[PDB]
Amino acid sequence: GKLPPVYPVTVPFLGHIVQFGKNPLEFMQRCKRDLKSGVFTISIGGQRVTIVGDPHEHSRFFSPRNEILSPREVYTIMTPVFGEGVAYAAPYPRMREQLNFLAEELTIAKFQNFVPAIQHEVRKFMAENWKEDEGVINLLEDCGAMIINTACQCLFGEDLRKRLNARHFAQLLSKMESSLIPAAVFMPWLLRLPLPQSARCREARAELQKILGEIIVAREKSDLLGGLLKAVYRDGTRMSLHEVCGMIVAAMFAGQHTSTITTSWSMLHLMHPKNKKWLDKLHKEIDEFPAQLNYDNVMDEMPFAERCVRESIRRDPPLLMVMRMVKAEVKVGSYVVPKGDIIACSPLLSHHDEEAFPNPRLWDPERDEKVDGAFIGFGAGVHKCIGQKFALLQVKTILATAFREYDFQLLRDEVPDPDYHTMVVGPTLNQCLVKYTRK
């Protein structure tokens, strides 16, 4: 029945956000140490944020359903991006069905042809941008382009890509991102006020929706769009085109940076001299494969590539925190978290806990969690990442294709520092220069 200890209220407005941008790990470790507790509370903009910082308590955070811990209220910022009535802006039961419908479309049973479609786009991109025997590139910009290109080949039909290509898509998604006020998570009063950038992203989304309508009419005269319009709710009705447009935008938005960042970190580690052992170990795994790879190879026959990916996400999780609004009080350890808190779990913090991942700064693909449930890079339980399998697939295929055909050398002594200022954390951009060399 104890309230968690409270790191007492600071004066600068949203001042803890500045600390989360500079040294989030060290900050949350200091709170843990100095309050002598794995569960503690900070105040951000008058909003109590209770951080669950002990991996043994993960199940208490990820288990409860929306009737008790709800993410809807924390992601009010995305409502102009995905649309009213879509995903988290929808009532709990319609929301639940919508997410499941998108998940049905990203199950491993749907990746027939994805590996080739991906390998083809990767090969295309390397042909168009990495022409020389040798050259310098920014790995992070380049993986980004590969991720959106590959996503579009796998997911969109030939007629859709003709009308709206991957470069126009990345732009829309990048423009929408830039309209967000990530700190408004702690300023719900602000989101009740008219914002002009909200209307602009609504107008942009309307134009995309008009394009998807024109295509459906044309088709009516199997890809992601076509799959979602086949969906039937339990009440026997279909998703509206509005709702479908919305879920497509959520799909793409989610993956743009996280998968980019994950591909990039994984490559940055593999190419580093200090990790020649793992690179040789990856080559022993993938040199076995035919040129034109297949679903079976990447999915079923790449366990060690998967580890390299996992540990990159372990060491440098792209989403630093996972958050809910407590709609009814919840037990955590010896504490009770009261109604109205934001309750948060931190993959960064739990991935750097010395008990769960001894020597946490060391990238080591052959480690395993010493605390069961501690790895939460793709979340857990009810709200577990539904794109995990696609993202792994994309990223593994890109790793194999790229490393089979080129070597890479980082143009700096140590692996990039993560840059924590951004919504999705990745390696610092101007530290990602890389020399490539065709084999």
Binding residue ranges for heme: 385
Q: Which of residues 235-264 bind ligand J5Y (CB under 6 A)?
A: 250, 253-254, 258
- With vertex at residue 393, the alpha carbon angle to CA 391 and CA 399, rounded to the nearest 5 degrees, is 100
45 binds, among ligand HEM, ligand J5Y, its own copies, none (CB under 5 to 8 A by kind): none
Cβ proximity to ligand J5Y, 228 vs 320, nearer residue: 320
Query: Which residue among 31, 49, 173, 348 contacts ligand J5Y (CB under 6 A)?
Result: 49
Q: Judging by beta carbons within 10 Å of its beta carbon (0-12, 13-18, 19+), is residue 103 exposed, middle or buried?
A: middle
Query: Which residue among 215, 239, 322, 344 contacts ligand HEM (CB under 6 A)?
Result: 322
401 binds, among ligand HEM, its own copies, ligand J5Y, none (CB under 5 to 8 A by kind): none
Of 80, 59, 297, the C-alpha closest to 179 is 80
Residues 397 and 115 sit within 8 Å (Cβ to Cβ) = yes
Q: Smallest distance, Å, CB 131 to ligand HEM? A: 29
Of 409, 428, 311, 431, the C-alpha closest to 363 is 311
206 binds ligand J5Y (CB under 6 A): no
Q: Letter for the amino acid at 159?
A: D
Structure tokens at 257: 């940076």
CA distance linking residue 410 with residue 185, whole number of Å: 37
Cβ proximity to ligand HEM, 254 vs 399, nearer residue: 254
CA distance linking residue 186 with residue 323, whole number of Å: 12
Query: Which residue among 385, 402, 425, 434 contacts ligand HEM (CB under 6 A)?
Result: 385
Q: Judging by beta carbons within 10 Å of its beta carbon (0-12, 13-18, 19+), is residue 218 exposed, middle or buried?
A: exposed
Q: Smallest distance, Å, CB 299 to ligand J5Y? A: 21
Q: Which of residues 37-96 bind ligand HEM (CB under 6 A)?
A: 71
Of 230, 381, 258, the C-alpha closest to 316 is 258
Structure tokens at 137: 């590139």
Query: Which residue among 144, 318, 365, 418 contacts ligand HEM (CB under 6 A)?
Result: 318
251 binds ligand HEM (CB under 6 A): yes
- Residues 6 or more apart whose Cβ sits within 8 Å of residue 110: 227
CA distance linking residue 377 with residue 359, whole number of Å: 18
Q: Smallest distance, Å, CB 411 to ligand J5Y? A: 28
Q: Smallest distance, Å, CB 386 to ligand HEM? A: 5
Q: Letter for the amino acid at 268?
A: L
CA distance linking residue 324 with residue 326, whole number of Å: 6
Q: Which residue is nearest to ligand J5Y (CB)?
A: 344
Cβ proximity to its own copies, 181 vs 218, nearer residue: 218
75 binds, among ligand HEM, ligand J5Y, its own copies, none (CB under 5 to 8 A by kind): ligand J5Y
Q: How far is CA 389 from the centre of its chain?
A: 12
* Count of residues of this chain found to bind ligand J5Y when the rule CB under 6 A is applied: 20
78 binds ligand J5Y (CB under 6 A): yes
Q: Which of residues 191-250 bind its own copies (CB under 8 A)?
A: 210, 213-214, 216-218, 232, 235-238, 240-242
Residues 228 and 196 sit within 8 Å (Cβ to Cβ) = no
Q: Which of residues 382-411 bind ligand J5Y (CB under 6 A)?
A: 385
111 binds, among ligand J5Y, its own copies, ligand HEM, none (CB under 5 to 8 A by kind): none
Q: Letter for the amino acid at 323?
A: M
Binding site for ligand HEM (CB under 6 A): 71, 99, 102, 251, 254-255, 258-259, 262, 313, 318-319, 322, 377-379, 383, 385-387, 390-391
Binding site for its own copies (CB under 8 A): 210, 213-214, 216-218, 232, 235-238, 240-242
